[PDB]
Amino acid sequence: SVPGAPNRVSFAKLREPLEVPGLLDVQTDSFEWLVGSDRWRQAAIDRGEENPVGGLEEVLAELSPIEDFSGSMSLSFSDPRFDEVKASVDECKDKDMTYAAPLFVTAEFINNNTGEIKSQTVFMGDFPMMTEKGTFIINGTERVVVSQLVRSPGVYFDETIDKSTEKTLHSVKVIPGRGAWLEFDVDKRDTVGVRIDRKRRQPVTVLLKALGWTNEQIVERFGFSEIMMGTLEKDTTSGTDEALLDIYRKLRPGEPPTKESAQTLLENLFFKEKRYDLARVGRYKVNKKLGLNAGKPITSSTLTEEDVVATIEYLVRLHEGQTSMTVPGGVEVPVEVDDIDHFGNRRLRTVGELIQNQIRVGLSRMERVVRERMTTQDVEAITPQTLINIRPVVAAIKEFFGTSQLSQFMDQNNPLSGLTHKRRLSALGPGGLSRERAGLEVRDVHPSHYGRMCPIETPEGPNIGLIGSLSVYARVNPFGFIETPYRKVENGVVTDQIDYLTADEEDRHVVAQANSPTDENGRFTEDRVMVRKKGGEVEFVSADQVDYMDVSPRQMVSVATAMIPFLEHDDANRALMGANMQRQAVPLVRSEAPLVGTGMELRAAIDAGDVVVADKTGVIEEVSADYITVMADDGTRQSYRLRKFARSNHGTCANQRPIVDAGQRVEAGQVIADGPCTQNGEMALGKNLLVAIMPWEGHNYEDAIILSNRLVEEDVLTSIHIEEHEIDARDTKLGAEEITRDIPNVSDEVLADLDERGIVRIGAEVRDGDILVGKVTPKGETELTPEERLLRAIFGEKAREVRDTSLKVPHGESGKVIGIRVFSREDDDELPAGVNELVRVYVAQKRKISDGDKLAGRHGNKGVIGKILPVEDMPFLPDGTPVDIILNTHGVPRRMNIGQILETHLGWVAKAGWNIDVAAGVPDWASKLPEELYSAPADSTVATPVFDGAQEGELAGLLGSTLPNRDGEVMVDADGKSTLFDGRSGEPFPYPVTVGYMYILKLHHLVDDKIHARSTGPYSMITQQPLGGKAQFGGQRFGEMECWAMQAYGAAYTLQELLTIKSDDTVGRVKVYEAIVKGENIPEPGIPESFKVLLKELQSLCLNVEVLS
């Protein structure tokens, strides 16, 4: 497999014919196509393409050439070339730059009148590039562009039933995606109407005549369907010219009707590439659907003369009932109704196409003024620069990378989160569906997800169903259709002829399961095989009817879902919860790979990029906590920087540590360093803890969890959290506010940790309310009150012109300062307008597990930590081992996630080695185990691949073959249960309980970030109500339902006091505070601002609203 590959025996019985492809290929291949890299060219030409064109070249060719209105000048662009990136990734991230490369294009100007030629290279600007991890470094932040899901333009056929007087009507709408509309629909009057540009129903014969058809040809060719005969009978147009004139009159009656303009408008409407285009994917879709112009390549971006007639003929065939059709000049194709949820119609807009669209818009905006500058300047004095402004294109590309919904912050919580984020399929954004629309119609699992979109893993938030993840075995078709691999089957024998097919290509075949038993040679051993039909239905067919076969059992699950052991035993809802929870695991101080897992732990770690892999074979020159040096066989040195204690976007600590030593031979692709949540190159999101399944004094009641104090003492569930505090100093109308150690009206003890320039020293410890960096602002008018005047006269402290505005540690936060960054205009830093200085301080803290912190496994079992008992209190095994965690029994069977019990049993089996009595012959249960899995030592790691894992019988048999402990006795019997002594009373529990090892992980939902409180604080400017939305001093919302509850209680006084005194009652609020502080009884509430304001407003409308007794 891979060079390192820590030994992890697998329970798989099937053979993998195809290795898992590059998980981050979707984000890289699209961009390689966009910039037309050499390797992309080689791959495209080797596929069977001639003269392939990249995205940038395609856009330039579409725009070029451009000719002026006079027709005497022409401008063209060609040969886009890229330069070396300005700086490296690390430098750009440190200095908040943008990782980009200069872009150059060869522009050529031709003077038609004379013949002058001007060729030169124009600087297009800095094109944002991407790293090897499929991320963009924008202003020092790692952003990710998620592939969008859109409806491919083309011709679609639908049929509905009229709900007024029964019967059915069929329609066809042509979606170009860049032009106008053109559809044909059938009414209940035995006719065929065409509604051009969605304006008004017109006869189809009118359109036919307009194109240049006559009655004789229509009656000679369209002699199959009677409805069209009736339409022609109803038609009043005689000649072709009248049809054009009639269409022009019906379209725009206002303008004068003339034959020439009538033809020109229709010619302009759809038969021009400058007004109507199919985006070079609609043409392919129409060719595949209608079947015209098959074989030969097509470059036209309009509707062919035969396309319209073929579409109309297909519509009438569909109404007629014909299941087959063919036209001269094409290939016979079937007849059926299309649906919008099917992926033969839904394409994928990857990062390359998303960038291409914005580049196209920018180039159009530039050309708008390019032609104007041509028409406003003098001739024989014009060079390419003098008529090319690069401002608009750069502005457009910059705006797309900082405002577009598709491009957003990369989830840096852990490697798996980032990996899943990169390969995400969103169904919203520019040109997509709204978040408040498409209910239970587009978010349902269509039978076409199988092999192209994971049907179980999806966000549970507002975006349920709209957002999904690509499957393990899937790669986007150059056109943009997700295709999946399948094994060719001929004459009932499976062969090694893997073929990638799309959804529509798959609807014409019969595919079988991957686990279907097969003979040694390859023939099918059974007769009836389970397969999938063309309708997305499962059926048993003959062995000869099998056409294809799945590559592997886990062809439908995603990367996140494939990390869940025993996924076939968990319910769909629980599997979804676990898959979405696995992306919220905070990296721990010391990671450890799971005892029981799948085969996806390794790959997911390497593809995520959170590890360092040797580029070429060599010997480790030296190893340090900061970098690794390796000498290759060719004598070329390589040095890898190890980013140490680096803050992730979400606040988790991201750091790497070497796992190699000097003199170690390393092969290409071997992991030499591991990331935050990786051990020996395998993902280690959580920890293996000893778990006993039993209720305990009600402390684990309602999904609560009891933990041992050992986890706290040994830092089993401890994490590092880093936060950044930023503050700026700028020029103001009263002067420029400066950062200074000196602060007015404050003691010298509070600022004992400040440095010479007024910033907290690195390594200092800070709690809430501590000064991080001094800052003062000009105040202005003082006008001291006599009380203050006398008070400061007795003290003698004269007035100070400045007011303290130093940065303070937010309430509830504490830690140590680990880094300080300073930017200033004095040193030519690129600060925003008016800002003189900027200071960032990083505070890192060592957060241990504590009560209320969420904690969950991989099977959707979640819970807060209700109590942390001391070591002696926890139940302990007879050998004296105290269990680390206790999970309530009542919550397992109901949630229908029995897979966690299997994980527990197999984890116990893995922790203590096993030895099957194979000396006398393989037992019946062990006859299926691979030869390598008959015996393993203690602390072994095993793999149970999803849908091809350990069977229940094999696990039950293994449970009865576990090795003894140091004393020489077995703790867990054949049933998976063990006796536990009570830690408080000492009496053994009356019945044995399930005990094992479970892999559980700490979620980011910590208590420290979810605690709020208010007594008195900031108030809104307009409503005068307490403001919220922030954890410092945010107020709670008292909705109308709570008011109903209070009214039901009859709690009149509480409701009044809560609606007025504690909200928008300025007069009485201060009185209430004064009464509370003075010990006086609270006064009666007044009248809320919400009523006085209402009264004044309603009076302002000339309404004489008055009160009376």
Partner: peptide
């Protein structure tokens, strides 16, 4: 999932 118009049209007479 549901807007005001659909929720309003949900409880119409429909008869």
């Amino acid at each position: 999932l549901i807007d005001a118009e659909e929720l309003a049209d949900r409880f119409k007479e429909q008869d």
